[PDB]
Design a protein around this ligand. Sequence first.
Ligand SMILES: OC[C@H]1O[C@@H](O[C@H]2[C@H](O)[C@@H](O)[C@H](O[C@H]3[C@H](O)[C@@H](O)[C@H](O[C@H]4[C@H](O)[C@@H](O)[C@H](O)O[C@@H]4CO)O[C@@H]3CO)O[C@@H]2CO)[C@H](O)[C@@H](O)[C@@H]1O
Ligand SMILES: *[C@@H]1O[C@H](CO)[C@@H](O[C@@H]2O[C@H](CO)[C@@H](O)[C@H](O)[C@H]2NC(C)=O)[C@H](O)[C@H]1NC(C)=O
Ligand SMILES: OC[C@H]1O[C@@H](O[C@H]2[C@H](O)[C@@H](O)[C@H](O)O[C@@H]2CO)[C@H](O)[C@@H](O)[C@@H]1O
Ligand SMILES: [Li+]
Length: 360
Amino acid sequence: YNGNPFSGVQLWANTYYSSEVHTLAIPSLSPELAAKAAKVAEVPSFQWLDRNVTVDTLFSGTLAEIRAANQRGANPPYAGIFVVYDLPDRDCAAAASNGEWSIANNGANNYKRYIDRIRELLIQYSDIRTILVIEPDSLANMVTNMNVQKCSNAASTYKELTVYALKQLNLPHVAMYMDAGHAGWLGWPANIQPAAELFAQIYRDAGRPAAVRGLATNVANYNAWSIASPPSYTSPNPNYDEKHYIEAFAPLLRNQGFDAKFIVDTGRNGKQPTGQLEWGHWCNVKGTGFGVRPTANTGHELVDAFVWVKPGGESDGTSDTSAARYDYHCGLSDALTPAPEAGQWFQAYFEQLLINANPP
Ligand SMILES: OC[C@H]1O[C@@H](O[C@H]2[C@H](O)[C@@H](O)[C@H](O[C@H]3[C@H](O)[C@@H](O)[C@H](O[C@H]4[C@H](O)[C@@H](O)[C@H](O)O[C@@H]4CO)O[C@@H]3CO)O[C@@H]2CO)[C@H](O)[C@@H](O)[C@@H]1O
Ligand SMILES: *[C@@H]1O[C@H](CO)[C@@H](O[C@@H]2O[C@H](CO)[C@@H](O)[C@H](O)[C@H]2NC(C)=O)[C@H](O)[C@H]1NC(C)=O
Ligand SMILES: OC[C@H]1O[C@@H](O[C@H]2[C@H](O)[C@@H](O)[C@H](O)O[C@@H]2CO)[C@H](O)[C@@H](O)[C@@H]1O
Ligand SMILES: [Li+]
């Protein structure tokens, strides 16, 4: 590429998500739901580099698989889709997705090497167009959650490491989208202006890297792209869906030198309204379905693609109240319970997403 990194490529559906579905879901399902689950195992969702171990195992593995498929003559050729998700003091406003590294224990250096090695593999696989979402939740937390001790303490590290990632992974075959929360997070009129300055400043301090295409929204969340009727839980936010958020956000970013395109996560937003009782409820939300299949055909000037970033069926957090990573949000009445550790397969949730899929 070129313009839109989603143009002229197919998105790779990774083997690890398909294996989960076949190994852990299908055996427990009816014949009809096993069929539907087989179709979903083939829908491309982003592969998360959530642990350092993934870099020289699952990440390099997937890159090799993609090269093999393209060498065999894939047409359009396959592009890889990955999430960089291992900041030290990760998930700073919550408990459920705390990561392996901490700032206190050499986390920043650990992250720099993690990034360095990712860069090496991208160089090694420069033949594979690679699309990255950078660090879901991180910068959105910087906008709204500076009152939270873990966030404010991590703030300077987050900003240094984000710039570092954007500079290091800035390669011609790569497109990056910085995570930018969602309409119910950064779309609030009181949050949208500080968000615009923070993103524009990170972008400029990173030297306006060519590989930075724009922002991802709705990652691991559930908002409508475009809905006529604002869900009750969205009131009084005028930016009640991702379309409203992105259209309000883009000119503010543009005014500060960051002319962003967007991708929107549609993997868990097929059923509207969702089962959320309040908008801020993010964990394993009840009454959700698989949404619009990933496509570059968005019909909207600012959106490069609808994508599945959060892999449906992988938990957002454990509901085990005695667990170290227990977060009360995962124990609420609109959260599906019992639920396993974040990232772990969550059969009952997977089932819900299948049943509620929309389109079917
Ligand atoms: O998305 C997955 C991710 O979620 C993280 O939790 C996020 C929620 O996703 C998000 O909905 C929530 O958004 C808040 C926002 O931060 C507040 O600024 C805003 O405050 C409103 C308030 O509700 C109104 O009463 C008031 O009048 O207006 C203000 C705005 O000025 O409320 C919204 C909705 O509740 O923020 C959460 C983070 O704190 C998780 O932490 C993460 O683990 C998940 O992966
Ligand atoms: C993160 O993972 C990398 C591998 O991707 C680790 O780097 C390797 O460390 C081992 C030592 O156990 C060596 O055998 C390798 O040669 C190292 N480098 C590479 C590029 O493979 C690294 O140690 C991990 N980081 C942390 C903080 O544990
Ligand atoms: O434990 C590794 C497991 O994690 C998955 O990534 C998770 C991440 O762990 C979690 O904190 C966040 O909320 O969601 C992502 C995506 O579900 C990863 O996708 C799996 O491959 C992996 O087995
Ligand atoms: Li999360």
